[PDB]
């Protein structure tokens, strides 16, 4: 399915990041067949219209669009990238690297909170924002 819009070349990506001025651009780098990307994209579609006011989601295929692999260290099976007014926003998830999510959370509310915090920090002017949760521990007991 994947009703979320897709970008088929680097040109689409680099004018999609600059297209939004009052909304956070979300880019999922990965592959549809990849299950983890499947989980994240299901979560995103579950909240695609909830964050329409202040966020936008685009799906980018690594094979179709491989130019960002070296610059963004796109070596994981899947990454999630946050941009605002041409500036990347780093998120302090507690996983060691603040640039990309690199994992698929099943709860859509966690992603909603993450994108809301990113928007709040980007409109205020901070380039690095703190996640309102710690993902170092999976919280499984």
């Amino acid at each position: 399915s994947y009703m979320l819009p897709h970008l088929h070349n680097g040109w689409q990506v680099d004018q999609a990041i600059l297209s939004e001025e009052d909304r956070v651009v979300v880019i999922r780098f990965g592959h549809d067949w990849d299950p983890t990307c499947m989980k994240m994209d299901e979560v995103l579609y579950s909240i695609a219209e909830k964050v329409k006011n202040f966020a936008v989601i685009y799906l980018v295929d690594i094979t179709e669009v491989p130019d960002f692999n070296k610059m963004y260290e796109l070596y994981d099976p899947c990454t999630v990238m946050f941009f605002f007014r041409n500036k990347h926003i780093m998120i302090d998830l507690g996983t060691g690297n603040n640039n990309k999510i690199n994992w698929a959370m099943e709860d859509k509310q966690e992603m909603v909170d993450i994108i809301e915090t990113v928007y709040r920090g980007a409109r205020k002017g901070r380039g690095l924002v703190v996640s309102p949760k710690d993902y170092s521990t999976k919280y499984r007991y």
């Binding site: 399915s1 549809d32 067949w33």
Partner: peptide, 13 residues
């Protein structure tokens, strides 16, 4: 649009 991604998914799976 959706069919273009469905064909890519089916071919790769």
């Amino acid at each position: 649009d959706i069919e273009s991604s469905l064909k890519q998914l089916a071919e790769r799976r």
